[PDB]
Amino acid sequence: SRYTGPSWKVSRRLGISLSGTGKELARRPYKPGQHGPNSRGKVSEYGMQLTEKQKLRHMYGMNERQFRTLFIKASKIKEGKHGVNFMVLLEQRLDNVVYRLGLATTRRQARQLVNHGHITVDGKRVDIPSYHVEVGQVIGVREKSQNISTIKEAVEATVGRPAFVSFDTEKLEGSFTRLPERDELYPEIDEALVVEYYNQ
Amino acid sequence: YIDPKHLELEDRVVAINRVTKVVKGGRRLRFAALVVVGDKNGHVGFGTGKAQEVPEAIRKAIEDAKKNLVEVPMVGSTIPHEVIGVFGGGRILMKPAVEGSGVAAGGPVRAVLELAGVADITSKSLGSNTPINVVRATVEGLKQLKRAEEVAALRGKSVEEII
Amino acid sequence: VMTDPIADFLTRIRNANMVKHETLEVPASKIKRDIAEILKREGFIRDVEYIEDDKQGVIRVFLKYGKNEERVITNLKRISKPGLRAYVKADEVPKVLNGLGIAIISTSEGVITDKEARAKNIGGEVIAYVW
Amino acid sequence: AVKIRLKRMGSKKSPFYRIVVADSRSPRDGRFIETVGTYNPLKDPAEVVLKEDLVLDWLSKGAQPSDTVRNILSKEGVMKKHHEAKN
Amino acid sequence: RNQRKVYQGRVVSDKMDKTITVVVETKKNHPIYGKRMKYSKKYKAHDENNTAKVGDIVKIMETRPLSATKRFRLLEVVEE
Amino acid sequence: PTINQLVRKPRKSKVEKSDSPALNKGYNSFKKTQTNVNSPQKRGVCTRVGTMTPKKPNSALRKYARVRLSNLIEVTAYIPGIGHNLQEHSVVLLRGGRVKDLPGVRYHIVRGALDTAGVNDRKQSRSKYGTKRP
RNA sequence: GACGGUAUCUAACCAGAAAGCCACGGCUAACUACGUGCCAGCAGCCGCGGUAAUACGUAGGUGGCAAGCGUUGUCCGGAUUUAUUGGGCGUAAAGCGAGCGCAGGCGGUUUCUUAAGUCUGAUGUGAAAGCCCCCGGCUCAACCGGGGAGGGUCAUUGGAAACU
RNA sequence: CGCGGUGCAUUAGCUAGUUGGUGAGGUAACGGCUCACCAAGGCCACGAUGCAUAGCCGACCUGAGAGGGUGAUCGGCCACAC
């Protein structure tokens, strides 16, 4: 299953801007629903931990089952802070790599590109948005697809690339030079709360 | 003694208990508030305040907690060693945890640890759930915690020799 | 009747330490002397001396207290008991307060601390914990 | 008699084989005496891993390779070694 | 040559001719609590000439079945 | 207890019992005995249908049926939802579940299964009460 | 070559055929309207319902999850609620009314010795598959393959002698 | 053959080829396996016997672990074929 409902409603429920523009939050920064505009009681600790868990999974557009399995893998990693490793794996997810490279404006758009197969890894077609992208693997657009307005517009519009990504405009090929650092990731999200949530 | 001043203390309301005193006319309702105030750097205290109204009870408890601040040893993000703190019914066991594991603890212990500034720890409550007693038991365990430097100094050997 | 002189020795130290008594005395035995000297060289007790008598001898322990009369010995615990002996293999040797305490262990090489036991990679009978 | 034969493994439509010494009466995927190699027909040049010394020893003891295993051992040259050993 | 199990034990019955009953008297750790508990296994050993008496420490080596219950052969009598 | 005491008489734990015993026992017609089979539900025939008074705190006319299950055990089961079509000799399916109000009801009659008709006009929580999506 | 014109690949067309379930008084993330009036009904526990119900029914919203969702059944956990790890017995359940005592459990100091327990090494074995660790193959994963590790109060055999 | 893995003592006695011996026979083979004699022995509160339940295991589910539960599919062993 893939979520398709309104994007602004989800972002404002989480209280942070998923797209990062802040456009959703700017106007009417209330939780969705008729009781959102009026003052609401404080949230319990469980609610706070749940909200952080939802923040990450809604950011990357994943379902709970896949999210849970990914967290377990992050735990298996031996070195480094557990929450940091989990966020690193979330980044390496194939959809996010396309999004970071800027071939798509949004993660939904990057996901649809991957699903329709316009992307290729190391010159090979890959239709699995869930695909794990290692450091140094070259993500490129399918040659037939290179001449489509959507991806070209996204490239020209995206002006800021994270340090860890290296991209080439003409070739439309990118790759992660190194694993993203904690501060490079979203700081507003607190990985410790998610860790404790799944500790249950 | 730890002076509250010069420390950027923040508080959390652990529990707000509506207590009753029976009076000839009927019930006299008051609010008892348990508060934990901490510095997120190793200082934390707990205070109790009773008042007819919830905000006033909380304020009284906050002032009491500041008076009772204590400092907790910390090695990295976790406590030095395993410790069991017992007060009355309350009984808590707190163990160091690996970095990033989070705060595994329940209810009032969560507030005490977060406010103290401990980020990773494993805790189990073997006693009652009574919030006041569990908080007291928690601070008893933390006071039991010992610094490697202090132990090395006391025993007359270098910390390297100790470990 | 006394069924564990070792546990009696540990409890004598514990009681004397609780009241901050300056010294204490116990009937002497080889295992007790070993425990006392381990505490001496680990700095838990100030000093140890031996009195020779006609019964079994006596061992006198001078307790150690830090500045502000703080107790050096937090507590002592008897692990191996006559009711239930406790044996640990070389890899099972425990850590008392992550090394801030010690475990006295009797091995084929003698009575040694847990640090020494896992340095030699030998197990033994876990006589006591101290911290 | 003792057989050197292929025990099937892998998944549906994606077979793999372990060259194992087993008694003829035993089930194909059941009891076997020892594993002596592997065989992956799905590779364009069929990939074979073999413990040639162990296979030769079993042949000397009197094991009877099945037809496919005999072809595999021939391609690996074990059969010629066994022939020369008989000489 | 491979070796058969040999056990030490104490005779407890010699009222049968050409045979004795021995007791091994081992100890085993309780699975849950680990205390050592006294455990008694007894064997029926064939005596060649009824030499051994009751309450004798003797050694017995396992053998082929000599009777319904016999499986051991007397070797030595170390104490009377 | 001492370790020797525990050795001489080890710990023994309490044995639990089912809240829905009738579901735990099957019946073998040939041998004419009861078997030990855990079943999520069980088929029964309504020997009686009616209403019952709750316990003291509550007041209502709770709708119930006395049912003889396929294993010949007779129990009393509740009928959830508003309005039903059950009658005696109606074949029903029973699931576990107590009713706090009622004294001796330990099972619920599944709606939408066998002769139990779904609840008319149900529109929320339709899975329960066994109504199709309108 | 049964599978089988099966997997797969290529090309054209169309957002067009393809989202439900449960929950929202506290525990527990999720709230307001009507209708209802200790009735109808809910409910896992606390408990809701007597004319102004966030707890019933409907509606609108919201939360959880998702080709699933929920209910029941059964097992483990939470349960330290049989406590070896890891509880108790003055008043909450719990010291036999008291003693004499067989077996059993435990046992004062010390020299020597032994090596059953205890510790330790080597060897053999604890199949394969499955967990776990590395490395590979299926577009990913599931799955599959390779190589390891583990797993015994194990058997044989060599050491140590503090403790039993 | 050693050792390991269910409940019930509101189940305490059980055993008479039973326990052992000497022969004889029988079996692929040891053996009361069978038989004739000779003895009266053998098992049992370290649970005999009896009753009830059950195919055993590698493994699987849970648990921080100790452990608790399960014994489908897959493989090994065993047993059975109205």
Ligand SMILES: CN[C@@H]1[C@H](O)[C@H](NC)[C@H]2O[C@@]3(O)C(=O)C[C@@H](C)O[C@H]3O[C@@H]2[C@H]1O
């Ligand atoms: C006899 N006068 C009584 C007496 O003074 C009571 N106090 C002792 C007083 O107590 C009250 O003040 C109370 O507080 C209780 C109330 C039932 O009656 C009140 O009036 C109470 C007065 O009426």
Ligand SMILES: [K+]
């Ligand atoms: K509710």
Ligand SMILES: [K+]
């Ligand atoms: K205990």
Ligand SMILES: [K+]
């Ligand atoms: K008394």
Ligand SMILES: [K+]
């Ligand atoms: K020994």
Ligand SMILES: [K+]
């Ligand atoms: K005979």
Ligand SMILES: [K+]
């Ligand atoms: K069976």
Ligand SMILES: [K+]
């Ligand atoms: K038969």
Ligand SMILES: [Mg+2]
């Ligand atoms: Mg799915």
Ligand SMILES: [Mg+2]
């Ligand atoms: Mg006070």
Ligand SMILES: [Mg+2]
């Ligand atoms: Mg080929």
Ligand SMILES: [Mg+2]
């Ligand atoms: Mg409902």
Ligand SMILES: [Mg+2]
């Ligand atoms: Mg809530």
Ligand SMILES: [Mg+2]
């Ligand atoms: Mg409602």
Ligand SMILES: [Mg+2]
């Ligand atoms: Mg338990």
Ligand SMILES: [Mg+2]
């Ligand atoms: Mg009383």
